[PDB]
Tab-separated table of C-alpha atoms in Angstrom:
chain	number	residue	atom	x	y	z
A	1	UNK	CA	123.372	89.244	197.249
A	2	UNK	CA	120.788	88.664	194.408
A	3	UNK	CA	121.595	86.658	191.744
A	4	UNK	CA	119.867	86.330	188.131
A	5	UNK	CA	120.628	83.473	185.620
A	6	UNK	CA	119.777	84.595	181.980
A	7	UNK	CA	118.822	82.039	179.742
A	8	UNK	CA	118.701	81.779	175.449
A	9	UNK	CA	118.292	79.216	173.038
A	10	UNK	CA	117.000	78.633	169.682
A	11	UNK	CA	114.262	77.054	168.495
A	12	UNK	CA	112.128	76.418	165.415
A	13	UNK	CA	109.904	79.426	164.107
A	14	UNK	CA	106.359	78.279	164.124
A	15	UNK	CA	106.257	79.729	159.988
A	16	UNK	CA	109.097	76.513	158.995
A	17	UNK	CA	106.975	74.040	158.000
A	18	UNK	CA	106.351	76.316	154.563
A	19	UNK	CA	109.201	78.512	154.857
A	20	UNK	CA	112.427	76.196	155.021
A	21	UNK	CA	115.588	74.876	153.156
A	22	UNK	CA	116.548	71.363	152.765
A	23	UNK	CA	120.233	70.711	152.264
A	24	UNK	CA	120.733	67.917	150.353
A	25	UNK	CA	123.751	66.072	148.861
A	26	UNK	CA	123.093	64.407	145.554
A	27	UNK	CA	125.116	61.786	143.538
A	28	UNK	CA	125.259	60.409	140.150
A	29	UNK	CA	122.461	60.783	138.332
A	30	UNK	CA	119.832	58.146	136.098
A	31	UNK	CA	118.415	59.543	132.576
A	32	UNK	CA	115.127	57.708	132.085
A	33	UNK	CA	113.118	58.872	128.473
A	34	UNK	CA	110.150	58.127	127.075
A	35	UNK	CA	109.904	57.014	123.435
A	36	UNK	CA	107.277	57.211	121.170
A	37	UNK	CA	108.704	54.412	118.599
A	38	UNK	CA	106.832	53.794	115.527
A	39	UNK	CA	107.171	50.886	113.186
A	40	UNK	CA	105.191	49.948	110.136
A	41	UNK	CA	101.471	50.888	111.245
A	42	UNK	CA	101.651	50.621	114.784
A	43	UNK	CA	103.147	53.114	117.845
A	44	UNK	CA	104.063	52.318	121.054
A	45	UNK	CA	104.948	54.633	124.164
A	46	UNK	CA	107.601	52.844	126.378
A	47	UNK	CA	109.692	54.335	128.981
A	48	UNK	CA	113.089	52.864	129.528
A	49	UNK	CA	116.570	53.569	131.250
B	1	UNK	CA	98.159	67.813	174.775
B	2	UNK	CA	97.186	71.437	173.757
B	3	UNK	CA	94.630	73.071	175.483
B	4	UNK	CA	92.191	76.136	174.334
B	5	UNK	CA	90.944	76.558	178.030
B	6	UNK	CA	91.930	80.266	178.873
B	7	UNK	CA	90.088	79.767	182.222
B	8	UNK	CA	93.411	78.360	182.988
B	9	UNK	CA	95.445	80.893	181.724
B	10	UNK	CA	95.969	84.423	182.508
B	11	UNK	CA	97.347	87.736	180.966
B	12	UNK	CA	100.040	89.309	182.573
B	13	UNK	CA	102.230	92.578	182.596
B	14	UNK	CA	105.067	93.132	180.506
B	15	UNK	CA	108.148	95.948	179.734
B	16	UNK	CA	107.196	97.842	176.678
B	17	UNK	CA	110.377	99.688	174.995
B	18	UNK	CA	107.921	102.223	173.684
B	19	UNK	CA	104.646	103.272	175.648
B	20	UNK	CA	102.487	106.007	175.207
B	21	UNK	CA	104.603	108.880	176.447
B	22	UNK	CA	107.661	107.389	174.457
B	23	UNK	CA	109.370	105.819	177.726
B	24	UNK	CA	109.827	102.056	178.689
B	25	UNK	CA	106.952	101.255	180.854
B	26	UNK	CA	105.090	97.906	182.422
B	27	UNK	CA	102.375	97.489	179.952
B	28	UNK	CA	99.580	95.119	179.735
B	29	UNK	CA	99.678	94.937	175.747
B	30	UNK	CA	103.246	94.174	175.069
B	31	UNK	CA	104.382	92.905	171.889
B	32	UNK	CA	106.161	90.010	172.537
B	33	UNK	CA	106.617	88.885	169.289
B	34	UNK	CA	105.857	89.914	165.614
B	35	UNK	CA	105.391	87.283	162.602
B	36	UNK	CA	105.839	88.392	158.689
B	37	UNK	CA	105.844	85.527	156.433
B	38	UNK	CA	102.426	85.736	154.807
B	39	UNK	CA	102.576	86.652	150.847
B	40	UNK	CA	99.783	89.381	151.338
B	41	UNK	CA	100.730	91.309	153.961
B	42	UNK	CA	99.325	90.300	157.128
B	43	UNK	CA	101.673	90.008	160.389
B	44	UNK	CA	100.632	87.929	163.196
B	45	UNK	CA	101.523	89.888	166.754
B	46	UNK	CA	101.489	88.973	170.205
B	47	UNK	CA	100.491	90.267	173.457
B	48	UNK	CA	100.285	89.942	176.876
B	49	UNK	CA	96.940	90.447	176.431
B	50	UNK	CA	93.811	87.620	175.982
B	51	UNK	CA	92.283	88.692	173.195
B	52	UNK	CA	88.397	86.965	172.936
B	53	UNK	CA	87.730	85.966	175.754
């Protein structure tokens, strides 16, 4: 009349905070370039949408 | 908290699959678990023993 109860779950292996995926859902993206315009004598680095 | 007092804690005996005479036996250096995720080849193991203390 013994009885045993058998437990299992899941957990986190201690080694995830290095080894581990991140699923990610991305959307429309932004182009954003640096330019390196030069007029007459002088040059000027800008960055601009 | 976590503690590192092992005056609190003790080993204990556990079922080995494999002991010396290739049966399943109660051991008191069972492997409980085995870790391989380094990039130079170490494994981190564990045991029902207390190992440094």
């Amino acid at each position: 009349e013994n009885t045993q109860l058998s437990e299992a779950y899941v957990e986190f292996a201690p080694d995830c905070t290095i080894d581990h995926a991140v699923a990610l859902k991305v959307h429309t993206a932004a182009l954003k370039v640096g330019l390196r315009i030069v007029y007459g004598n002088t040059t000027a680095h800008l960055d601009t949408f | 908290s976590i503690t590192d007092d092992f005056t609190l804690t003790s080993p204990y005996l556990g079922f080995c699959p494999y002991c010396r005479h290739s049966a399943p036996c109660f051991s008191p250096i069972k492997i409980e678990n085995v870790w391989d995720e380094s990039d130079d080849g170490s494994i981190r193991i564990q045991v029902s023993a207390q190992f440094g203390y």
